[PDB]
Design a protein around this ligand. Structure first.
Ligand SMILES: [Mg+2]
Ligand SMILES: [Mg+2]
Ligand SMILES: [Mg+2]
Ligand SMILES: [Mg+2]
Ligand SMILES: [Mg+2]
Ligand SMILES: [Mg+2]
Ligand SMILES: [Mg+2]
Ligand SMILES: [Mg+2]
Ligand SMILES: [Mg+2]
Ligand SMILES: [Mg+2]
Ligand SMILES: [Mg+2]
Ligand SMILES: [Mg+2]
Ligand SMILES: [Mg+2]
Lengths: 95, 131, 149, 213
RNA sequence: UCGAACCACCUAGUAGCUGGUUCACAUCGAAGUUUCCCUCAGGAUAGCUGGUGCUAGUAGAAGUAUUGUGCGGUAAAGCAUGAUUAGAGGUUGGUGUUAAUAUCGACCUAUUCUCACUUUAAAUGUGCAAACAAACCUGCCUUAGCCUGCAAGGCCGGAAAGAAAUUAGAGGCACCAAGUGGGCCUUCUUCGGUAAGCGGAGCAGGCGAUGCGGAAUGAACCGCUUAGGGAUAUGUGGCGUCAAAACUUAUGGGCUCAUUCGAUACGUGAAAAGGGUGUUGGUGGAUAACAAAUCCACCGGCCCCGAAAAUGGAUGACGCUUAAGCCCAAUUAGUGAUUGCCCAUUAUUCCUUUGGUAAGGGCGGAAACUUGGAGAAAGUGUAGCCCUUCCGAUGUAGAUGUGGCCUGGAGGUUAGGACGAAGCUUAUGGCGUGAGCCUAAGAUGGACCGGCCUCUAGUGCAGAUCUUGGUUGGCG
RNA sequence: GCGACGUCGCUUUUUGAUCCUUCGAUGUCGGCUCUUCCUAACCUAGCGCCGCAGAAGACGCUAAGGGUUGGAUUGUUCACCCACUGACAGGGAACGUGAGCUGGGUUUAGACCGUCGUGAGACAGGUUGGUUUUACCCUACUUAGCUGGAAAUUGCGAGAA
């Protein structure tokens, strides 16, 4: 029924700094800044050191509690990347 | 605190006027009472031995003592009945302290997910697991 | 209520049994009945002359009358709130000498002959032994039971 | 829509009525060609003989098994051959059926028939299934078994009620397992009879002294 | 007034039809079935029931088992009387063929498929018997039977005891008489019908005729069955509020998110397959590679859709969702063996009544510190002769009893009344379970009348589209 | 888009049963009039999708919100045409609706006819003529007033968005 699988980790290099305050994430860089919200079941966001590691542990787990962990992993890396690299969007037409 | 103690029920078939020394049958059943142990003692012999509770006598039912209270693993080969897929067996390896404890969780798991209750449930091989 | 004749609803009742048909016994002709003994009024067919009504078939009762070739049998009939001692007149072949008392005919025959043997008699030969009591039973084959599928 | 869709006889609220000295005007069922395919077929040909046994006490009419005699049949050619399959039907519509047609015109309206003179007359025939009835048995190779998980479901959905495939460990019209069957041909335990065969049992008779004179 | 006027009379015409039929309590208490009937809206007859009984009645007892001993042919089963039939191919007809060939029927075979006919083949049933003459050791008589004695009948004495359970809540008849003779529901099974909240049955239970307790609600279901009270404890059902009880249990095992979740049976049935690429469970079978783990097939739902109506809208309401849902468990918390807790016309116990004619004991004078009774009378019945003891206590139709109630009058007796009788009024109390009685007080009444024992009847009224009188609403 | 064969859920303005309620009276269809309700969507409304280039249709889903006619013949319901229209959808409300109307059909007593019957008469066959009572009562609604009222008339009882 219920089990545990693993833990999720992200490294935070120079040029990017992440907080943990009110369990929310602040990521800044040298090309832009962005902050948002990533709450979910058993998903308590705690950043260990200021520039060491973004860790998000859950203690319970099932198909739904575990199909929601690594989406914050999909939504924390692009915080750290967009503040340094950024992704451009292009649009075309025809006539 | 876990109900459903473990009973050691043994019995001949009222010797005999025919065979004069029928083979003794012993088996261990988890039950709330011993009246419920004998009730399910005379269901195995009525089926697995074709012996009635009338034409036989219970030799010595007994309460198994215990194991030194310490956590360990348990795989309980359990066989239930239901209109929900009639007569399926199962394994459902539990991790409780005593055999009484784990088989309790076995019943409270089947009645939880298959709604199969005490009399629709046979048990076999309540053993332990090292790893 | 279209048909209620003297022989209604009695196909299987008067029908002879399987592979035993034909003439009645020579025992049933050589029986000996008195006024007073008991008789099973088991109406057999293949005689078809003197069979009683259906009702009096599993019934046993006193012989109040023994004519030359007709036994007269009283039989209790629970009519509605009382039983009638019916007085049926059948022939002998529809009659067995009823065992129904060998249960104590043969009991008090040897039961007294040994109560006398136990009271005065000549000697008291030991009889049937006790039935239900305890015992330290020694097994001869162990076993268990889990399942067979 | 003019004939009751075989549902008002899904329960044995009535006796069985046999075609007998009782009923005398019984009509004809449209299911006739029970067997289909290789016909003189020998017995060593197909390894698998799966049954199709029902589950409940349903009652299917003469109109759904008759297409199962064709529906569960036809899908051979589209994914197999006819001569590589045994299509033998193993039932018959025995229970002759009555019918009461109310509201006659000879008389008045809505007060002509006050429930009298209103019993049955022949209309057709249906069947009584109880738990454990074989609808349509199957014989096949190994490379032809999963064929009629469709063809059956093609005709299992022509039926009133449901059904299942019964994977078997028998050698068809015999009482022998497959694993030991390859061993019995090694010692020739079983004989042949045409499209079927009979088992030489224990208590063998002195008659078949098959050894050289 | 006319498909036979009107008046009076026969005539109070007859009505198996409709309506009504006047007090109390107590003791019991049913039936809608049998047969017969121009019978089926009714009768008669049995059964049911009451009263009065008679009688030597632990027996000629039993909706029970045991033991023996009979009986049976339904369930299941199985296919000979039949089947039902096609599948493998080969005597008998017709025929399409070139003495060679089939062809379908009949047949021939191993079968087959699934049914009514088969068999001492159930369960449940039911018939019988089971301790003082049923066996004996004997002895009569007429001998009926059969050629002295057997056996037989009507007898009989000498002798006989049990080393078929229970209740052993007493057996047996008899008489008189009602009421009922429209049942319905239900369990189990089952005939007919498309079906039914359908018709017809068998069995038992109910309702009727009956409450109480709770399934929100309901003649019937679940408990329990019923004199008036108190307490203790339960039953069914419950314990989030309504609502007494987990003041939301220290609850434990899992399950469940449901854009109408789900949640007390029987109410009627809720939802049928079907699938999935869904959440949880299980089995068959790979890789050690998915795009250090990842597969190919299905079993199982909870759950998603499939699915829908018309006043507004129902788990009963709110509401509940890390439950107050579901399935399992629990019952003071893995510390040590019991009743977590709340509710009854039930149970237990305690008083009180009342009946049983239920048992007893006194049934005319003595003492335990204060009075009551083992001194209140020989008695159906009361304001009981007195104590005390057991048990039962509902009830429609009906029956019966009452030292029982009441009205008018008679024969007796006792007695009132102008110092106020009947009557009448009632926040006039009391006292009787009640019918009712008695009292007081009338800024009522004015002249008759109460108690008791018998007698007597035009004797009790809420209800008849009652009758008569009067009033009233609507209504200024 | 459906159609072989078929089947399986749910359907009432359904064909009949059932005999449960009503026989000391629930007054008969259809209309008129008026209100409501449902969606299984007829129209408009929202995308969707095709052998949907424009045009124009095509299939589908979402939505009860609004809209859904005027006539001829028929007592009609239905049906049929006529014509408009964006289209003239399908239902419930006791087959919504007579102490509201109407009285055409059912509708009796008159009469004629057809068949039937010996006849009186019968026909659920046709034709014609044929009562339609009562609100002044309670509530519902509709408007029209009046007056009490916070322990919703009471305790002094005490709570201020
Ligand atoms: Mg059978
Ligand atoms: Mg009996
Ligand atoms: Mg009751
Ligand atoms: Mg309810
Ligand atoms: Mg109490
Ligand atoms: Mg829980
Ligand atoms: Mg008088
Ligand atoms: Mg009078
Ligand atoms: Mg009066
Ligand atoms: Mg009156
Ligand atoms: Mg109208
Ligand atoms: Mg007009
Ligand atoms: Mg009003």
């Amino acid at each position: 029924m219920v089990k545990v699988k693993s833990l999720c980790t992200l490294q935070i290099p120079e040029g990017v700094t992440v907080d943990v305050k009110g369990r929310k994430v602040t990521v800044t860089g040298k090309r832009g800044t962005l902050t948002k919200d990533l709450t979910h079941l058993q998903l308590d966001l705690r950043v260990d050191k200021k520039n060491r590691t973004f860790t998000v542990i859950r203690w319970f787990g099932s198909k739904i509690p575990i199909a929601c962990l690594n989406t914050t992993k999909a939504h924390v890396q692009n915080m750290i990347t967009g503040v340094t690299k950024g992704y451009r969007f292009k649009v075309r037409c025809a006539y | 605190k876990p109900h459903l103690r473990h009973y050691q029920v043994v019995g001949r078939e009222s010797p005999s006027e025919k065979n004069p020394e029928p083979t003794v049958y012993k088996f261990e059943v988890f039950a709330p009472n011993f009246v419920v142990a004998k009730s399910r003692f005379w269901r195995m012999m009525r089926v697995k031995n074709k012996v009635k509770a009338t034409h036989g006598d219970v030799l010595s039912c007994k309460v198994v003592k215990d194991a030194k209270l310490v956590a360990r693993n348990y795989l309980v080969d359990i066989a239930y009945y239901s209109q929900r897929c009639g007569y399926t067996r199962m394994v459902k390896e539990f991790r409780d302290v005593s055999k009484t404890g784990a088989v309790s969780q076995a019943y409270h798991d089947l009645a939880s997910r298959h709604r199969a209750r005490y009399h629709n449930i046979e048990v076999l091989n309540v053993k332990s697991i090292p790893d | 209520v279209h048909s209620y004749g003297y022989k209604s609803g009695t196909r299987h009742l008067f029908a002879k049994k399987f592979r035993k048909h034909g003439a009645p016994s020579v025992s049933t002709i050589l029986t000996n009945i008195k006024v007073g003994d008991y008789v099973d009024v088991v109406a057999d067919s293949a005689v078809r002359e003197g069979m009683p009504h259906k009702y009096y078939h599993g019934r046993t009762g006193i012989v109040w009358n023994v004519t030359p070739r007709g036994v007269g049998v009283i039989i209790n009939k629970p009519v509605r709130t009382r039983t009638l001692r019916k007085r049926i007149c059948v022939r002998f072949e529809h009659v067995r000498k009823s065992r129904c008392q060998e249960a104590f005919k043969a009991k008090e025959h040897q039961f007294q002959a040994y109560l006398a043997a136990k009271k005065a008699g000549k000697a008291l030969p030991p009889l049937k032994k006790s039935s239900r009591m305890g015992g330290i039973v020694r097994p001869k084959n162990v076993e268990v039971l889990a399942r067979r599928v | 829509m003019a004939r009751r869709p075989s549902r008002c006889y899904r329960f044995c609220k009535n006796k069985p009525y046999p075609k007998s000295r009782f009923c005398r005007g019984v009509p004809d069922p449209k299911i006739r060609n029970f067997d289909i395919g290789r016909r003189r077929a020998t017995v060593d040909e197909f390894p698998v003989c799966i049954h199709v046994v029902s589950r409940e006490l349903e009652q299917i009419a003469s109109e759904a098994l008759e297409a199962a005699r064709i529906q569960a049949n036809k899908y051979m050619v589209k994914r197999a051959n006819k001569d590589v399959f045994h299509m033998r039907t193993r039932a018959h519509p025995f229970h002759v059926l009555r019918i009461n047609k109310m509201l006659s015109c000879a008389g008045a309206d809505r007060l002509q028939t006050g429930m009298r003179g209103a019993f049955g007359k022949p209309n057709g025939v249906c069947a009584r299934v109880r738990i454990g009835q074989i609808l349509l048995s199957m014989r096949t190779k190994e490379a032809y078994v999963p064929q009629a998980f469709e063809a059956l479901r093609r005709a299992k959905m022509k039926f009133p009620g449901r059904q299942i495939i019964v994977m078997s460990k028998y050698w068809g019209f015999t009482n022998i397992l497959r694993t030991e069957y390859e061993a019995l041909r090694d010692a020739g335990k079983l004989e042949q009879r045409g499209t079927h065969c009979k088992l030489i049992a224990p208590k063998g008779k002195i008659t078949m002294r098959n050894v050289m004179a």
